[PDB]
Amino acid sequence: AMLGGIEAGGTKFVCAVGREDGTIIDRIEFPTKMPDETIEKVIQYFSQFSLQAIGIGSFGPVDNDKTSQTYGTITATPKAGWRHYPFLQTVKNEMKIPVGFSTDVNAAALGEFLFGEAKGLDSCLYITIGTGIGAGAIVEGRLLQGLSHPEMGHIYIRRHPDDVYQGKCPYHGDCFEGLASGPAIEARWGKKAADLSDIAQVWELEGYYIAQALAQYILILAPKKIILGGGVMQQKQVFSYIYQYVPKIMNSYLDFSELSDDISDYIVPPRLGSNAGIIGTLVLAHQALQAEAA
Amino acid sequence: AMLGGIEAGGTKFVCAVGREDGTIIDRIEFPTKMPDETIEKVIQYFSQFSLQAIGIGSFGPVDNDKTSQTYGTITATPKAGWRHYPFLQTVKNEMKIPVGFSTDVNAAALGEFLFGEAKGLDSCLYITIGTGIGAGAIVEGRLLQGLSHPEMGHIYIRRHPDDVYQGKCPYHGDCFEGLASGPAIEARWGKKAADLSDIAQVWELEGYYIAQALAQYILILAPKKIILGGGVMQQKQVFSYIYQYVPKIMNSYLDFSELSDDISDYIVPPRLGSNAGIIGTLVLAHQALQAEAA
Ligand SMILES: Nc1ncnc2c1ncn2[C@@H]1O[C@H](COP(=O)(O)OP(=O)(O)O)[C@@H](O)[C@H]1O
Ligand SMILES: Nc1ncnc2c1ncn2[C@@H]1O[C@H](COP(=O)(O)OP(=O)(O)O)[C@@H](O)[C@H]1O
Ligand SMILES: OC[C@H]1O[C@](O)(CO)[C@@H](O)[C@@H]1O
Ligand SMILES: OC[C@H]1O[C@](O)(CO)[C@@H](O)[C@@H]1O
Ligand SMILES: [Zn+2]
Ligand SMILES: [Zn+2]
């Protein structure tokens, strides 16, 4: 009963083989290059296994409307060749088994929903903070997909009055991702994020920005758990600042222990560590396989 | 097959009797006073009719978790007597028929979802802009209820650099409601909203603020239709400014015609005019009645 997953990133692809309970049997990774040659490496890796289904969690924006002619393509990216490349369809054509598709952060959300911190709940929100910011939400046990999947990393939070950085996002400048991604932390401070470890000021600022973003998500979706992952969130100090700032921002407007005394159990790192997304792509495989039996 | 509705407002109650197709048979309104005497007027009006069920759409925050001990109470308000008053339970006890409960804007959303601009869709967002700002969302045909219902009117949008008004909201100051409610427009400009009709500047500012709020809701929920109601939105000029500003804010990040060329059919006034909420309380009645048959 083996399943394949592809977590398509802008810098790397991670492919894996595993089971529906989330165990990883095997995995490989390789640099993201042009699509033809990148997917060819994908196919070459899976050809060794007898797989029943595959799931793709891709960086987006993507067309995640099953009824759309461009379903399963990346709809916007500056990365050469990926926009409008028939990603889902080329994998379906070559492997000839069901293939599920979603964003990478939707994949992480399913992982943490079935096997991680949101197991037993019916709602959660997974936010990744790395090269980009993105988030995926589960409402009533099902991924949130409206007109588009969400693009929660491009909301315009309020600047800090002492921050003079113009922002990294090429569309918005100083949206959340623009102010608070890993690359925004570097462009702002002049060194790599992992190396700013001991400059408290960087992490108060980062936490202030995440906190503002979370206030909005709480007011708008009100998820029953918020899981924060990605490279930047390896600085576990950021959590303590978020815990201090969310309540100050909300200012007691919504009386839930999740938002005050027990906030440290509401906004948490992922139980699956950095594997939420790849594990979640096994879930997307499994769903695709069940939809074909249906 | 007659149903009752109560739209509980901070200034007035509107009660009505009607049918599940949304027709209003009769209605009454009266000032919101203390609860005992206000609910007593409610009971006195319904005693004339043979009703099968009732629905309450209340101003909130409210406890809208069916499994909660304080289910069907208003959990926060400065209005004398209403906090923690057993509103739902006192109506259930006196009428002895099923009673549905939700926010007032959730009620409006159901109205427009079954009978208005979102009929045939599976998702929508209803926003009221009046004494307060609030919103209710339908995802996959079902009201969005997480940890709390949403309180979308208290998000911290960005100020306009020329606006020096400190904000009306007693919790946040210059959150969205704080900047853009009817009373914020008056406290800011020194006259009543209906009388600022011809000062274009008031409505550019109002539209700029709504537009910022909508950008966030689109990025976070991505609803398939956005309906704007309430007293302030009787100045239909505000729509033209929103249509100009949403696309500038999003800056082509999400390529959907709803967000650009066809934006005038995406963000719209309610088809049910100012009766979305009361009509929606008939829907909540009908749902409560079906849950009892189940
Ligand atoms: N241990 C770390 N601590 C802080 N920042 C890190 C760490 N590792 C990577 N980063 C930063 O996070 C970003 C990478 O995000 P990540 O989730 O690791 O991958 P990607 O977003 O490229 O798929 C980079 O800008 C990098 O500087
Ligand atoms: N025709 C109108 N044009 C502009 N503003 C209005 C109009 N009617 C009422 N208002 C304003 O909208 C607010 C009232 O909101 P509304 O939805 O009518 O009721 P409430 O929020 O009290 O239930 C007030 O601050 C008032 O000044
Ligand atoms: O991968 C992190 C996030 O960055 C984006 O590509 C755009 O900001 C999102 O689609 C994604 O979920
Ligand atoms: O009634 C308009 C809106 O104002 C509030 O009472 C708080 O801002 C919300 O609960 C409501 O939906
Ligand atoms: Zn952006
Ligand atoms: Zn507020």
XYZ file of C-alpha atoms and ligand atoms in Angstrom:
668
model
C 0.000 0.000 0.000
C 2.738 2.599 -0.996
C 2.295 6.202 -1.798
C 4.427 8.893 -3.331
C 4.839 12.560 -2.417
C 6.516 15.541 -4.083
C 7.072 18.749 -2.134
C 7.925 21.189 -4.981
C 9.916 24.113 -3.673
C 11.515 26.991 -5.489
C 15.020 25.870 -4.419
C 14.532 22.132 -4.057
C 12.223 19.210 -4.717
C 11.831 16.547 -2.064
C 10.251 13.295 -3.220
C 9.296 10.539 -0.869
C 7.619 7.202 -0.668
C 5.515 6.292 2.369
C 2.275 4.971 3.838
C -1.096 6.522 4.687
C -0.311 6.527 8.441
C 2.439 9.023 7.529
C 5.586 6.937 7.851
C 8.322 7.840 5.425
C 9.853 4.794 3.772
C 12.374 6.628 1.597
C 13.235 10.046 0.355
C 15.337 11.984 -2.004
C 15.964 15.627 -2.769
C 17.464 17.608 -5.636
C 17.700 21.233 -6.890
C 14.775 22.811 -8.654
C 15.908 23.509 -12.232
C 13.772 23.780 -15.389
C 10.600 21.697 -15.229
C 11.238 19.074 -17.898
C 14.426 17.964 -16.270
C 13.158 18.379 -12.750
C 10.038 16.225 -13.334
C 12.166 13.718 -15.183
C 14.238 13.276 -12.006
C 10.907 12.801 -10.178
C 9.778 10.077 -12.485
C 13.156 8.385 -12.371
C 13.010 8.183 -8.560
C 9.441 6.828 -8.409
C 10.105 4.246 -11.124
C 11.803 2.067 -8.491
C 8.676 1.671 -6.392
C 5.212 0.254 -6.974
C 3.059 3.154 -6.042
C -0.681 3.294 -5.836
C -0.947 7.159 -5.781
C 1.054 10.383 -5.610
C 0.458 13.779 -3.994
C 2.037 17.147 -5.007
C 2.340 20.038 -2.539
C 3.721 22.880 -4.649
C 4.864 26.438 -4.014
C 2.192 28.757 -5.501
C 0.145 30.574 -6.432
C -1.360 27.533 -8.081
C -4.639 26.739 -9.788
C -6.237 24.470 -7.233
C -9.729 24.462 -8.696
C -10.355 20.870 -9.812
C -12.855 22.168 -12.383
C -10.434 24.593 -14.058
C -8.658 23.997 -17.344
C -5.318 25.081 -15.792
C -5.844 22.911 -12.684
C -2.527 21.696 -11.290
C -0.303 24.436 -12.678
C 1.626 27.162 -10.946
C -0.148 30.385 -12.070
C 2.447 32.950 -10.990
C 6.211 32.719 -10.383
C 9.405 34.531 -11.486
C 11.193 31.113 -11.658
C 12.068 30.296 -15.319
C 9.747 27.800 -16.952
C 7.314 27.010 -14.088
C 4.440 29.322 -14.817
C 1.744 27.446 -16.639
C 3.854 24.299 -16.954
C 1.455 21.287 -16.902
C 2.909 19.954 -13.702
C -0.006 17.796 -12.383
C -0.876 16.525 -15.861
C 2.731 15.571 -16.787
C 2.962 13.551 -13.554
C -0.453 11.919 -14.118
C 0.531 11.077 -17.722
C 3.827 9.454 -16.798
C 2.887 7.532 -13.648
C -0.707 6.559 -14.671
C -1.998 6.519 -11.154
C -4.101 9.055 -9.214
C -2.294 12.235 -8.205
C -3.537 14.698 -5.647
C -2.496 18.338 -5.783
C -2.401 21.344 -3.380
C -0.136 24.009 -2.070
C 2.855 23.152 -0.014
C 1.379 24.789 3.095
C -1.959 23.031 2.537
C 0.120 19.842 2.515
C 1.780 20.849 5.829
C -1.646 21.608 7.297
C -2.989 18.159 6.418
C 0.085 16.602 7.986
C -0.352 18.352 11.282
C -4.128 17.876 11.099
C -3.939 14.058 10.787
C -0.732 13.319 12.681
C 0.462 16.446 14.513
C -0.680 19.214 16.792
C -4.204 19.484 15.323
C -4.992 15.746 15.491
C -8.452 15.460 17.044
C -9.521 19.061 16.136
C -11.615 20.026 13.165
C -9.817 23.214 12.364
C -6.274 24.428 12.144
C -3.936 26.894 10.423
C -0.352 26.023 9.286
C 1.904 28.981 8.547
C 5.362 28.638 7.045
C 7.890 31.394 7.459
C 10.930 30.896 5.207
C 11.883 32.089 1.750
C 8.238 33.019 1.539
C 5.342 33.266 3.881
C 2.258 31.135 3.230
C -0.521 29.404 5.109
C -3.031 26.636 4.726
C -6.231 26.216 6.681
C -8.524 23.362 7.529
C -12.198 24.249 8.230
C -14.549 21.502 9.313
C -11.977 18.859 8.414
C -11.388 20.133 4.864
C -8.816 22.436 3.258
C -9.980 25.989 2.769
C -10.339 26.595 -1.006
C -12.422 29.593 -2.106
C -11.985 31.553 -5.293
C -8.317 30.739 -4.779
C -6.384 28.980 -2.108
C -5.276 31.546 0.483
C -2.238 33.733 0.084
C -2.056 34.872 3.661
C 1.549 35.962 3.465
C 0.738 39.047 1.357
C -1.532 40.834 3.790
C -0.483 44.402 4.663
C 0.256 44.397 8.398
C 1.294 47.574 10.110
C 4.919 48.644 10.034
C 6.955 49.122 13.161
C 7.636 52.868 13.523
C 11.424 52.182 14.001
C 11.827 49.937 10.922
C 12.974 51.644 7.847
C 13.255 48.606 5.580
C 11.183 49.052 2.354
C 10.275 45.343 2.051
C 11.250 42.402 -0.053
C 8.007 41.532 -1.875
C 8.156 42.396 -5.529
C 4.355 42.809 -5.733
C 3.551 44.719 -2.530
C 6.887 45.766 -1.032
C 5.998 45.712 2.638
C 3.324 43.110 2.989
C 3.873 40.512 5.732
C 6.179 38.324 3.606
C 7.854 41.494 2.459
C 8.589 42.489 6.055
C 9.105 39.155 7.794
C 10.395 36.415 5.480
C 13.839 34.981 5.886
C 15.145 37.050 2.995
C 13.536 40.178 4.443
C 15.380 39.589 7.652
C 18.659 39.400 5.689
C 18.092 42.324 3.342
C 17.120 44.358 6.439
C 19.936 43.400 8.825
C 22.778 42.644 6.333
C 23.529 39.072 7.532
C 21.936 35.629 7.193
C 19.070 34.784 9.562
C 20.785 31.768 11.247
C 23.642 34.238 12.102
C 21.432 36.894 13.784
C 20.720 34.350 16.460
C 21.918 36.552 19.318
C 20.678 39.994 18.318
C 17.468 40.128 20.354
C 16.162 43.126 18.355
C 15.765 41.079 15.126
C 13.527 38.609 16.864
C 11.384 41.169 18.706
C 10.739 42.714 15.306
C 10.075 39.397 13.623
C 7.712 38.390 16.477
C 5.935 41.712 16.397
C 5.228 41.165 12.720
C 4.054 37.551 13.050
C 1.859 38.601 16.003
C 0.127 41.248 13.880
C -0.484 38.763 11.181
C -1.836 36.192 13.621
C -4.259 38.794 15.174
C -5.797 39.227 11.738
C -6.042 35.471 11.058
C -7.635 34.918 14.480
C -10.159 37.678 13.905
C -10.991 36.439 10.377
C -10.769 32.585 10.574
C -10.430 31.957 14.321
C -8.583 28.613 13.911
C -8.600 26.160 16.857
C -4.767 25.777 16.585
C -2.021 27.712 14.795
C 1.175 25.858 13.796
C 4.268 27.866 12.765
C 6.977 26.241 10.701
C 9.716 27.062 8.220
C 13.313 28.101 8.403
C 12.829 31.310 10.316
C 10.853 29.517 13.019
C 13.877 27.447 13.923
C 14.730 30.515 16.070
C 12.440 29.253 18.806
C 12.884 32.667 20.641
C 10.390 34.157 18.196
C 7.607 32.200 19.931
C 8.117 34.012 23.229
C 7.695 37.378 21.520
C 4.585 36.257 19.638
C 3.061 35.096 22.972
C 3.654 38.575 24.462
C 2.354 40.546 21.478
C -0.838 38.730 20.330
C -2.707 39.519 23.544
C -1.583 43.167 23.551
C -2.832 43.532 19.948
C -6.228 41.828 20.594
C -6.549 43.737 23.883
C -8.959 41.301 25.486
C -11.593 41.628 22.776
C -12.102 37.818 22.485
C -12.135 35.943 25.792
C -10.660 32.518 25.092
C -7.857 30.931 27.040
C -6.200 30.095 23.717
C -5.619 33.790 23.261
C -4.294 34.557 26.755
C -3.162 32.137 29.505
C -2.880 29.054 27.337
C -1.518 30.871 24.273
C 1.606 28.743 24.436
C -0.516 25.752 23.504
C -2.477 27.547 20.765
C 0.404 28.835 18.625
C 2.972 26.036 18.506
C 5.727 24.542 16.372
C 4.748 21.517 14.265
C 4.866 18.123 15.915
C 6.198 16.677 12.686
C 9.082 19.168 12.762
C 10.251 19.994 9.261
C 8.422 17.048 7.676
C 4.849 18.250 7.953
C 4.712 19.144 4.279
C 6.191 15.921 2.870
C 4.077 13.795 5.224
C 1.062 15.824 4.120
C 1.738 15.049 0.459
C 1.221 11.361 1.405
C -2.160 12.397 2.697
C -2.978 14.133 -0.567
C -1.937 10.853 -2.372
C -4.192 8.825 -0.161
C -7.139 11.180 -0.777
C -6.542 11.052 -4.516
C -6.580 7.225 -4.306
C -9.839 7.142 -2.374
C -11.492 9.532 -4.846
C -10.621 7.116 -7.644
C -12.151 4.138 -5.771
C -15.343 6.317 -5.207
C -45.432 26.435 8.284
C -44.559 29.798 10.064
C -41.289 30.860 11.480
C -40.112 33.631 13.732
C -36.991 35.796 13.585
C -35.362 38.274 15.970
C -32.592 40.558 14.743
C -31.184 41.848 18.081
C -29.410 45.140 17.590
C -27.851 47.474 20.093
C -30.355 50.247 19.240
C -33.356 48.226 18.120
C -34.905 44.780 17.943
C -36.746 43.757 14.803
C -38.983 40.708 15.131
C -40.676 39.093 12.204
C -42.785 36.179 11.181
C -42.244 34.511 7.805
C -41.709 31.366 5.749
C -38.670 29.267 4.827
C -38.602 30.670 1.259
C -37.814 34.014 2.940
C -41.081 35.901 2.591
C -41.856 38.236 5.443
C -45.431 37.908 6.652
C -45.261 40.517 9.412
C -42.817 42.553 11.372
C -42.380 44.807 14.281
C -39.574 46.831 15.792
C -38.875 48.479 19.137
C -35.958 50.060 21.076
C -33.406 47.866 22.759
C -33.739 48.489 26.511
C -32.862 46.140 29.394
C -33.176 42.467 28.477
C -36.079 41.351 30.654
C -38.361 43.958 29.223
C -36.996 43.701 25.724
C -37.483 39.902 25.524
C -40.890 40.298 27.095
C -41.885 42.519 24.152
C -40.525 39.739 21.896
C -42.644 37.101 23.498
C -45.699 39.327 23.454
C -45.368 39.833 19.684
C -44.860 36.136 18.867
C -47.744 35.052 21.100
C -50.145 36.070 18.314
C -48.782 33.556 15.832
C -48.462 29.783 15.732
C -44.805 29.366 15.126
C -42.901 26.194 14.522
C -39.387 27.691 15.172
C -37.486 30.909 15.849
C -34.048 32.205 14.850
C -31.958 34.892 16.660
C -29.287 36.912 14.838
C -27.691 38.984 17.595
C -25.040 41.687 17.783
C -21.927 40.098 19.367
C -19.483 38.937 20.384
C -21.627 35.954 21.239
C -20.978 32.406 22.376
C -21.919 30.484 19.269
C -20.453 27.147 20.292
C -23.431 24.789 20.625
C -21.417 22.690 23.090
C -20.625 25.568 25.463
C -22.359 26.233 28.759
C -22.801 29.934 27.836
C -24.096 29.098 24.333
C -26.556 31.726 23.125
C -25.363 34.628 25.255
C -23.684 37.858 24.307
C -20.159 37.525 25.811
C -19.009 41.143 25.545
C -20.909 44.449 25.342
C -20.952 47.841 27.130
C -24.803 47.853 26.854
C -26.350 47.559 30.369
C -27.632 44.107 31.219
C -26.851 42.171 27.996
C -23.562 40.545 28.815
C -24.146 37.005 29.925
C -27.928 37.393 29.877
C -29.432 33.963 28.977
C -30.913 35.251 25.771
C -31.280 31.991 23.739
C -32.384 30.003 26.789
C -35.021 32.560 27.925
C -36.525 32.478 24.416
C -36.413 28.655 24.262
C -38.028 28.457 27.729
C -40.890 30.795 26.899
C -41.769 29.717 23.354
C -41.049 25.945 23.753
C -40.072 25.465 20.168
C -36.642 25.121 18.516
C -34.591 28.309 18.345
C -31.557 28.803 16.176
C -28.876 31.307 17.121
C -26.013 33.184 15.360
C -24.594 36.601 14.851
C -26.512 39.228 13.027
C -24.028 39.256 10.138
C -24.063 35.446 9.963
C -27.833 35.843 9.617
C -27.350 38.373 6.769
C -24.908 35.992 5.087
C -27.397 33.115 5.134
C -30.022 35.411 3.663
C -27.906 36.434 0.732
C -26.570 32.882 0.386
C -30.036 31.291 -0.015
C -31.971 34.129 -1.632
C -29.584 36.913 -2.687
C -26.363 37.577 -4.514
C -24.640 34.334 -3.436
C -27.522 32.013 -4.401
C -25.968 29.154 -6.368
C -22.419 29.647 -4.921
C -20.933 27.679 -2.082
C -19.080 30.518 -0.489
C -19.707 34.118 0.365
C -18.845 36.933 2.781
C -21.422 39.467 4.136
C -19.978 42.616 5.679
C -22.076 45.204 7.477
C -20.804 48.721 7.888
C -22.927 50.732 10.339
C -22.728 51.440 14.046
C -20.226 48.623 14.009
C -18.381 46.644 11.438
C -18.872 42.873 11.313
C -18.864 40.028 8.832
C -20.152 36.527 8.390
C -18.791 33.911 6.036
C -20.114 30.796 4.402
C -17.531 28.109 3.464
C -18.707 25.035 1.616
C -22.331 25.940 2.286
C -21.901 26.347 6.058
C -21.279 29.317 8.357
C -17.679 29.785 9.376
C -17.415 29.023 13.130
C -13.939 28.324 14.532
C -12.796 28.973 18.063
C -15.172 31.919 17.829
C -17.313 33.336 15.113
C -15.289 35.939 13.203
C -14.848 39.495 14.357
C -13.524 40.841 11.106
C -14.287 44.444 11.921
C -11.448 44.706 14.468
C -8.537 43.976 12.175
C -5.807 46.647 12.122
C -5.728 48.002 8.565
C -3.238 50.649 7.619
C -4.014 54.283 8.315
C -4.192 56.871 5.591
C -1.191 59.203 6.029
C -3.516 62.304 5.868
C -6.025 61.072 8.490
C -5.424 62.251 11.945
C -8.476 60.715 13.609
C -7.484 58.487 16.601
C -10.338 55.985 16.087
C -13.612 55.130 17.692
C -13.061 51.559 18.929
C -12.794 51.379 22.673
C -10.671 48.197 22.513
C -8.254 48.951 19.660
C -8.731 52.621 18.783
C -7.939 52.517 15.092
C -8.919 49.086 13.948
C -11.135 48.932 10.843
C -14.378 49.574 12.765
C -12.523 52.231 14.679
C -11.583 54.001 11.447
C -14.544 53.300 9.177
C -17.814 52.770 11.060
C -20.640 55.224 10.788
C -19.775 56.738 14.151
C -16.115 56.996 13.148
C -17.127 58.958 10.120
C -19.060 61.371 12.376
C -16.505 61.728 15.155
C -13.911 62.372 12.410
C -15.797 64.864 10.226
C -18.081 66.541 12.839
C -21.422 65.837 11.077
C -23.726 62.847 10.570
C -22.846 60.414 7.769
C -26.098 60.893 5.750
C -25.180 64.655 5.716
C -21.623 64.222 4.326
C -23.207 62.977 1.151
C -21.514 65.547 -1.078
C -18.034 65.803 0.408
C -16.174 63.440 -1.921
C -13.167 63.250 0.447
C -15.144 61.378 3.161
C -16.054 58.652 0.739
C -12.595 58.265 -0.817
C -11.331 57.741 2.718
C -14.116 55.365 3.651
C -13.559 53.391 0.405
C -9.825 53.299 0.910
C -10.396 51.737 4.309
C -12.969 49.165 3.166
C -10.679 48.272 0.233
C -7.793 47.530 2.607
C -9.991 45.377 4.695
C -11.326 43.514 1.672
C -7.731 42.846 0.374
C -7.025 41.039 3.629
C -10.276 39.025 3.549
C -9.617 38.036 -0.075
C -6.082 36.944 0.719
C -7.182 34.994 3.828
C -10.637 33.512 2.928
C -10.914 34.242 -0.805
C -14.755 34.293 -0.828
C -16.556 33.747 -4.169
C -18.723 36.880 -3.535
C -18.525 39.804 -1.106
C -21.764 41.586 -0.116
C -21.579 44.991 1.626
C -24.511 46.246 3.642
C -25.365 48.538 6.532
C -26.124 52.182 6.966
C -22.868 53.550 5.655
C -23.198 51.537 2.452
C -26.326 53.435 1.525
C -23.795 55.954 0.113
C -23.509 53.908 -3.058
C -20.518 56.164 -4.147
C -18.323 54.179 -1.768
C -18.529 51.203 -4.151
C -16.802 53.082 -6.964
C -13.855 53.885 -4.706
C -13.592 50.307 -3.442
C -13.508 49.091 -7.089
C -10.571 51.440 -7.813
C -8.578 50.611 -4.678
C -8.800 46.792 -4.272
C -6.862 46.118 -7.471
C -4.196 48.726 -6.654
C -3.705 47.110 -3.216
C -3.527 43.502 -4.561
C -1.326 44.696 -7.442
C -2.141 41.808 -9.745
C -0.930 39.133 -7.344
C -4.059 36.938 -7.843
C -5.303 36.704 -11.428
C -9.075 36.338 -11.227
C -11.557 38.456 -13.105
C -13.449 38.902 -9.833
C -10.541 40.968 -8.619
C -10.089 43.133 -11.728
C -12.422 43.570 -14.738
C -15.503 42.033 -13.178
C -14.905 43.451 -9.688
C -18.216 45.269 -9.892
C -19.944 41.905 -9.797
C -17.768 40.466 -7.010
C -18.241 43.154 -4.347
C -21.910 44.134 -4.468
C -24.758 45.475 -2.354
C -27.188 42.872 -0.987
C -30.024 41.779 -3.228
C -32.287 41.689 -0.201
C -31.453 45.335 0.530
C -31.682 46.060 4.236
C -33.584 42.847 5.010
C -30.822 40.308 4.557
C -30.398 39.887 8.294
C -34.077 39.480 9.225
C -34.673 37.131 6.282
C -31.607 35.186 7.397
C -33.025 34.737 10.897
C -35.900 32.823 9.214
C -33.258 30.571 7.762
C -31.729 30.006 11.180
C -35.297 29.116 12.437
C -35.758 26.660 9.635
C -32.383 25.012 10.344
C -33.206 24.766 14.034
C -36.513 23.071 13.098
C -34.832 20.549 10.823
C -32.249 19.695 13.498
C -35.095 18.851 15.866
C -36.767 16.543 13.297
C -33.296 14.826 12.794
N 18.153 27.590 11.267
C 17.683 28.747 10.745
N 17.438 29.850 11.520
C 16.965 31.016 10.995
N 16.722 31.151 9.683
C 16.934 30.121 8.826
C 17.427 28.823 9.292
N 17.522 27.994 8.231
C 17.118 28.711 7.155
N 16.769 29.976 7.533
C 16.227 31.088 6.707
O 14.875 30.738 6.288
C 14.764 30.897 4.861
C 14.526 29.499 4.233
O 13.203 28.973 4.434
P 12.847 27.396 4.471
O 11.472 27.014 5.006
O 14.048 26.782 5.176
O 12.965 26.990 2.916
P 12.184 27.473 1.570
O 11.232 28.576 2.045
O 13.303 27.960 0.608
O 11.518 26.203 1.008
C 16.066 31.605 4.351
O 15.949 33.013 4.064
C 17.098 31.367 5.463
O 18.017 32.443 5.724
N -28.515 56.735 4.634
C -27.343 56.740 5.308
N -26.172 57.163 4.735
C -24.990 57.168 5.414
N -24.909 56.766 6.690
C -26.009 56.330 7.354
C -27.323 56.273 6.711
N -28.215 55.786 7.598
C -27.521 55.547 8.736
N -26.207 55.875 8.568
C -25.074 55.739 9.523
O -24.794 54.320 9.709
C -24.767 54.023 11.118
C -25.951 53.073 11.437
O -25.767 51.720 10.989
P -26.976 50.713 10.611
O -26.602 49.442 9.859
O -27.996 51.626 9.947
O -27.565 50.340 12.065
P -26.930 49.616 13.379
O -25.463 49.363 13.015
O -27.140 50.629 14.538
O -27.794 48.361 13.609
C -24.818 55.380 11.900
O -23.563 55.849 12.434
C -25.383 56.389 10.889
O -24.843 57.721 10.945
O 6.116 28.422 -0.007
C 5.794 29.537 0.865
C 4.666 30.399 0.268
O 5.221 31.364 -0.648
C 4.301 31.419 -1.803
O 4.926 30.700 -2.932
C 3.971 32.851 -2.153
O 4.336 33.685 -1.067
C 2.967 30.706 -1.429
O 2.158 30.158 -2.522
C 3.579 29.626 -0.547
O 2.594 28.889 0.163
O -23.431 44.427 14.397
C -22.204 44.807 13.723
C -20.988 44.090 14.338
O -20.509 44.831 15.479
C -20.163 43.830 16.510
O -21.215 43.843 17.546
C -18.794 44.112 17.085
O -18.111 45.008 16.227
C -20.116 42.417 15.856
O -20.342 41.257 16.725
C -21.248 42.640 14.861
O -21.348 41.585 13.915
Zn 3.429 40.559 -1.076
Zn -11.670 47.270 17.438
